[PDB]
């Protein structure tokens, strides 16, 4: 019989287990025997307190480096304001030591944990690339609780070196099975930001994770978009509990908050899943998340059922992660077929946007060719357009099975006249659908102003396979 941890703050970790069903079902995975042994996770942030009494026993120097100062020791820089506490708080969520009389426990409390010190300085393209590409045959899972500014007017993503690091990681990392990249979807809720305008979360190579409050609501800081995959608990209002973890100066905190706390919990659950089947590819892991995540009792006004019967929301993706279900399904999982890519250039001529523009196109999805796709994974609409006030635009894409993805919602603070330059808006909401048939793109002006512009390119890019499907939910 499994004995649950005895750490002094474990009873306050409401999100790991309980009788109330408002949890991530992590104790069920522990009782199946999975605690993270043999898995390596690295936190890409402002450093890690490698001598913390709740981290030292799991610390891994092979998973660590200091990119800011060009040395191997990722110890954070100590200041009166404790500004460099952020990475230590994230690490304890993943792999804080269990049954040692100190603070609480990590989701994967027997995993090995490291940190890359890379945010305490100017964060260039080269700095990102060196961190994402660190020791890729030793580190299994990378966790990133940072990104472009959440001011609600930025459009930005990885530059050339960083994008090259993503492709090298999923292609050759982890013995050719592919590095696992976990991303926090963002804190821009108060600015009405869209996480499709962030190239890191919007990438197909990252699992982008959103947040829910203890009572099951959309937190004030949450950003909605179609590229989010799933959700873990984090903070909310002052009557709702928060996240318990290791803090700077060898302390314990019960007040870790925001999008920053959601990605590390997902990284820990993925660590338990890899222990249950070390042969899973980067794409296998996203399939497992899609099939096992749970919508129930998360409140949102946009829940919709897609073409294969799964509920999906722009605030939550496919719902809350379920650790017990993840490790169970992983054990006898059959590896997916190699990934196919079908490129469809839609437009024959430019189109004026004006007040509203609708573009309809029936596709065969590369029928008769080696890259024929009958079973979709990610889909992208790569758009080039000019417009006089970018934040007045709303953009939607409808799949042949009738699933309406919001690619872009209105952004009141985005006054840019720069438009979009081949920006690859991504949706997860049509996963496992057949993409043959009519696709519909809608672009509209959400304001009463007399705005003007032109759509000059629309490439529909489909990813997936032609085998292995399941009876729709």
């Amino acid at each position: 019989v499994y004995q649950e941890p005895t750490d002094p703050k474990f009873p306050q970790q409401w999100y790991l287990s309980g009788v109330t069903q408002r949890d991530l079902n992590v104790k069920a995975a522990w009782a199946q025997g999975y605690t993270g042994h043999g898995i390596v996770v690295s936190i890409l942030d402002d450093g890690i307190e490698k001598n913390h009494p709740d981290l030292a026993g799991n610390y891994d120097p092979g998973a660590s480096f200091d990119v800011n100062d060009q040395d191997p020791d990722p110890q954070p820089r100590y200041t009166q304001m404790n500004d460099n506490r952020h990475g230590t708080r994230c690490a304890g969520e993943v792999a804080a030591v269990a049954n040692n009389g100190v603070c609480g426990v990590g989701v994967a409390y027997n995993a090995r944990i490291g940190g890359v010190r890379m945010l305490d300085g100017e964060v260039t393209d080269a700095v990102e690339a060196r961190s994402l590409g660190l020791n890729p045959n030793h580190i299994h899972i990378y966790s990133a609780s940072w990104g472009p500014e959440d001011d609600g007017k930025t459009v930005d993503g990885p530059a050339r070196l960083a994008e090259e690091a993503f492709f090298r990681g999923v292609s050759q990392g982890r013995g050719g099975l592919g590095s696992i990249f976990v991303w926090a979807s963002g804190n821009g809720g108060r600015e009405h930001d869209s996480c499709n305008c962030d190239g890191y979360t919007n990438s197909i190579y990252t699992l982008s994770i959103s947040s829910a409050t203890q009572f099951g609501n959309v937190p004030w800081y949450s950003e909605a978009c179609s590229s989010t995959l799933a959700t873990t608990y984090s903070s909310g209002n002052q009557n709702e509990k928060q996240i318990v973890t290791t803090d700077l100066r060898q302390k314990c905190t019960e007040s870790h908050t925001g999008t920053s706390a959601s990605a590390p919990l997902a990284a820990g659950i993925i660590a338990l899943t890899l222990e249950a089947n070390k042969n899973l590819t980067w794409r296998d892991m996203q399939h497992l998340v899609v099939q096992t995540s749970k919508p129930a009792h998360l409140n949102a006004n946009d829940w919709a059922t897609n073409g294969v019967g799964r509920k999906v929301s722009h605030s939550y993706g496919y719902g809350l992660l379920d650790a017990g279900a993840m490790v169970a399904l992983a054990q006898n999982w059959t590896t997916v077929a190699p990934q196919r890519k079908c490129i469809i250039d839609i437009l024959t001529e430019p189109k004026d946007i004006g007040k509203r523009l609708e573009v309809r196109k029936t596709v065969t999805a590369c029928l008769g060719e080696p890259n024929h796709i009958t079973r979709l994974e990610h889909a992208q609409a790569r758009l080039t357009l000019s417009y006089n006030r970018r934040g007045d635009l709303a953009i939607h894409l409808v799949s042949p099975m009738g699933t309406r993805s919001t690619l872009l919602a209105a952004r009141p603070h985005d006054y840019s006249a720069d438009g979009f330059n081949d920006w690859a808006f991504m949706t997860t909401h049509s996963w496992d659908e057949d993409p043959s048939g009519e696709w519909v793109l809608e672009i509209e002006n959400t304001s009463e102003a007399n705005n003007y512009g032109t759509l000059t390119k629309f490439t529909l890019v489909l990813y997936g396979t032609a085998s292995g499907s399941l009876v729709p939910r």
């Binding site: 260039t124 940072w146 500014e149 920053s260």
Partner: peptide
């Protein structure tokens, strides 16, 4: 700044 926590 280019990147934020």
């Amino acid at each position: 700044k280019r990147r934020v926590k």
